[PDB]
Structures are given as structure tokens and as C-alpha cells.
Amino acid sequence: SGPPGPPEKPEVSNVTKNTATVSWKRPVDDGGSEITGYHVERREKKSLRWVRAIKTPVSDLRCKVTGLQEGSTYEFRVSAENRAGIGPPSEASDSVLMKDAAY
Ligand SMILES: [Zn+2]
């Protein structure tokens, strides 16, 4: 009974100039104990390092990510944690370009 497995590929939606919604599913493998929260990370397209996209983990399976740079392209990934700790991350989401209202 250890940490969870990866969630499935997250989905990104409701993209504005500096916010987006990231949604995902509960990992198929919870490691044998209840999922207590999720880490969400982001990576600018063709940058190497993944960084925190939210200040602290969330419990719901979606969140509004803020503080994104207009004109930049980002991908997101999600890691689940249980009482035993953090599991490996999901595969990266599709990338999204941060652009303001197209109308
Ligand atoms: Zn954690």
C-alpha cells in the first residue's frame, strides 16, 4: 500500500489571456488508500522544467490555473497523492496558447 499511480491525460479549457481550467480523472490505481489531493504543474512549450501551477494541492478534479503569461503556450500535468505520498505525474495535456477573448 503505497502512493497512487498517474491520472489520465488532463484536459484544458476556458482559456483566457492568463487563466485556464485544467480537469482530470481519478487515477485508476490509488495505491490502496484514499486520494487526498492533486498537484498540478505547468510547462511552457519547449521549456524543460515543470513548475507548480497552483499554490497548494486541490481535492476536486479540476481547478482554475492563474498567473499564466499572455502569448505563451503551456501544457499541464497532474499528480495524485494519498497518505503514503505523491505518485508519478500524468502525461502532459495538449498545449494551449494564452490568448484573450477572440470576440
Ligand atoms: Zn503533495
Author numbering: 3 to 105
Paper lines:
Titin is a protein expressed in the skeletal and cardiac, or striated, muscle of vertebrates that plays various roles in muscle structure and function. Encoded by the gene TTN, titin spans half a sarcomere (the basic contractile unit of muscle) and has various functions including preventing sarcomere over-extension (Gautel and Djinović-Carugo, 2016), acting as a molecular ruler for thick filament formation and as a hub for numerous signalling molecules (Kruger and Linke, 2011, Linke and Hamdani, 2014). Fn3 domains are only found in the A-band region of titin, where they are arranged with Ig domains in a pattern termed super-repeats, which themselves are repeated. Fn3 domains have a characteristic beta sandwich fold, with a core of hydrophobic residues as the “filling” between two beta sheets that pack against each other face-to-face.
